[PDB]
C-alpha cells in the first residue's frame with residue numbers, strides 16, 4: 065500500500081485474493097496443449113523476457129483471448145504463462161465483478177489496472193470475460209473498456225490482459241477486436257487424460273496399470289480435465305461404498321485399492337459436460353477467428 069489512494073479496503077481485496085505471484089512452476093500440471101503452449105511462449109513469454117527485441121513490428125499483442133469448452137485448465141494456463149515471465153499475476157472473474165462485487169466494481173477495475181500497472185511485468189487474467197463485454201453492470205462493463213484501451217495507449221509496458229471464455233460465439237466485432245490473438249484451448253487428448261488421472265490418483269490406494277490406463281483412455285472420449293477429476297472422485301467412491309458400518313471404525317489403510325472397474329462404473333455416472341454440437345460450434349468459431 066503506497067503511492068495511490070482508493071478505499072483502503074479495495075486495495076486489500078487485491079493484495080488478498082487477486083494478486084498472486086508464483087515462481088518457476090513451468091507448465092507443471094497443465095497436460096498437453098502443445099500448440100497453445102508454443103504460442104503463449106512466442107506471443108507473451110518471449111516478449112516479456114526480451115522487450116528490447118520485441119518492439120516495432122515485433123511488439124506482442126496487448127490482449128490475448130483463451131476460449132474453449134469449460135474445464136480445460138484455462139485459468140491455470142494463465143498462471144503458468146505468468147510464472148514463466150516472472151510476472152505478477154492477477155486472477156479475476158467477470159462474475160465476481162458483475163455480482164459479488166458491484167458498485168464497488170468500477171472502482172476496482174480501475175485499481176486493478178493501477179496495481180497491475182506498477183507490478184510490471186504484470187498479467188491480468190479475466191475469467192468469463194464474455195459477460196463483461198456483452199444496471200451497475202454497464203457502469204462497470206464500461207470502466208473496463210476504458211481501462212483496457214489505456215493498456216493499448218502505453219507502448220513499452222509489459223502488461224498483458226489475458227481473457228478466457230467458454231462462450232466466444234458471444235463476442236461482437238468490437239469485442240474480438242480487443243484481442244489480437246485468440247487461442248482455442250480444447251479438451252484433453254487421450255494421452256493427456258491419463259496423465260491427469262495419474263496426478264489425481266497420487267496419494268490414493270489404487271491398482272491402476274498402464275494396460276488399464278489404456279482402457280480408461282478408451283472410454284473417456286469427450287472428457288474435459290474437470291470431468292476427469294469428477295471421474296476420479298467417483299471412481300474413488302467404489303472402495304468407500306464396499307464398507308458400510310465399519311466405515312467409522314476401519315483403518316484407512318485397510319480400504320480397498322481403487323481399480324479399473326471403479327472407473328468403468330464411475331464412467332457410467334460421470335458423463336462429458338460438452339455436447340458434440342458444441343465442439344463444432346467451437347471449431348467453426350476457431351477456424352474463422354482463432355490463431356489456429
Ligand SMILES: Nc1ncnc2c1ncn2[C@@H]1O[C@H](COP(=O)(O)OP(=O)(O)O)[C@@H](O)[C@H]1O
Pocket residue numbers: 093094095096097133134135136137138139140141228252260288289290293
Ligand atoms: N491440462 C489440463 N487441461 C484441462 N483441464 C485440466 C488440465 N489439468 C488439470 N485440469 C483439470 O481442470 C480443472 C480446472 O479447470 P480450469 O483451469 O478451471 O479450466 P477453465 O478455465 O478452462 O474452465 C481442475 O480441477 C483440473 O483437475
